[PDB]
Amino acid sequence: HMKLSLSPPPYADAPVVVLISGLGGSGSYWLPQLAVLEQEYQVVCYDQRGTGNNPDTLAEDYSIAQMAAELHQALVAAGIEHYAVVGHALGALVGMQLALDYPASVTVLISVNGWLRINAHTRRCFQVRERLLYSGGAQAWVEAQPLFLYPADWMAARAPRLEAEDALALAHFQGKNNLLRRLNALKRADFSHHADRIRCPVQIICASDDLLVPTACSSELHAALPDSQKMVMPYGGHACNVTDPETFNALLLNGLASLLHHR
Amino acid sequence: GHMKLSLSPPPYADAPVVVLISGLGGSGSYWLPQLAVLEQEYQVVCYDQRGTGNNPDTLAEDYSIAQMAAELHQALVAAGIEHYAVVGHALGALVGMQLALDYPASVTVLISVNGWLRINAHTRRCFQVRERLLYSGGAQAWVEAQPLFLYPADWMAARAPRLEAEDALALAHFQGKNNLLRRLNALKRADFSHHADRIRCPVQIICASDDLLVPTACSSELHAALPDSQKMVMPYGGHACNVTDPETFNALLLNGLASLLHHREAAL
């Protein structure tokens, strides 16, 4: 079913790296990582089901299990049976789910500002953001969204870009139904008792100034996982790969190479 | 006078006075983690802003920062305080600037904590979000969102029981829709960008790199525009950086007040 964006391999049989975005679901989230990653890997990006170019009306029972299954089956269908996963936030949860359900496929896993189970803090954030959704629709959602993603100074020095992104986010808004189904799936994901079984090498990347997910979630992940390394960026926010790609990209390239080689 | 002020005892005869001016929540208790260190060297004044806390009132439609300064200033003169330092947080920093403009013979030195010259588009965006919550969900939804704009995530996440108790206090003391909206209007309209020349007293600018509500670019703007300022940037602590990392904040504040009062001795 699901459309995937496969980059050209830089050389024969380059290892595959699948990039999994967070709640916005969009493959284009990873734009500032694509050039460096395509230099070494066959990169896969995609829009998650119910978002972007994979529109759908998501069902009531929609789960992270299903999200993993959808991506994994699309990959197998594209001829990809072994792959690395780099996941952002919700995308890290899908990555963990893939490492649990398809351990013969997932080579290594990178979690960017992910978590074992949703923190009270992140719930509080989503309670505020749901309130905006219900009272002010897509416009109010999009208005608040970057305040959870980017540092203030980063955003404030980039008004023309924020304006263009705010217009894009509203025009490509995934809709109330799918957002609420995906949020539900997000909140219910709980890997705290399954982290043992995630046996592939794992890199945990987080930013100290992430407003949406406290880095204590990454510390929790790191304590629970059998084979993980944790790197903390001092700044950059939840969307730390967007705001400081120079630091992020160096952690990602070294991390991927390290994890594939300890495997 | 009607406006209640909380005066600490002076530590010695004719100790310089330092007036602490809180941000939008208006509450003198905001400064609790600074009081012990400050009272050792200064006569400290704290207060609840009119329309908030223990100075309740229904604020009128034309309410402005000019009026806020007038209210605090008159209360100070009435308590026998004619020369005083101002430490202001956010909106409080704007009141402090206003006081430096309207009562230059009184304000000895000014410290701006995560203040600004005029409201940034980013801060407007933040307040627009928060206004939506106010209008759609009342005090409960306002208070629910509030700490997200004040504190780092990790600081908050490690302190759920404290946040819960502060949220209940904030709800029971909620300044009310009318006053909040009047004070926000006042806040947004304050514009010192053409008046910075007139702020002639020594100034310290303190900010936090991780302030979500006011980007530190505002403090950089203040620093470029003021005739006599120093700027210190804390690496972490958020908008409420005196609450979250008082050990760093207090050191900057105590050293700042001493440095500024020495500048003033040379400028006198």
Swiss-Prot record, chain A:
EC code: 3.5.1.-
Q: Which UniProt keywords apply?
A: Hydrolase
A GO term for molecular function: hydrolase activity, acting on carbon-nitrogen (but not peptide) bonds, in linear amides
Keyword Hydrolase attached: yes
Reactions it catalyzes? carbamate + 2 H(+) = NH4(+) + CO2
Q: List the disulfide bonds.
A: none
| Keyword Nucleus in record | no
Q: Name one GO biological process term.
A: nitrogen utilization
Q: Which NCBIfam families match?
A: RutD
Q: Which PANTHER family match?
A: MONOACYLGLYCEROL LIPASE
**Protein family per UniProt:** Belongs to the AB hydrolase superfamily. Hydrolase RutD family.
Role this protein plays: Involved in pyrimidine catabolism. May facilitate the hydrolysis of carbamate, a reaction that can also occur spontaneously.
**Protein name in UniProt:** Putative carbamate hydrolase RutD
Organism encoding this protein: Escherichia coli (strain SE11)
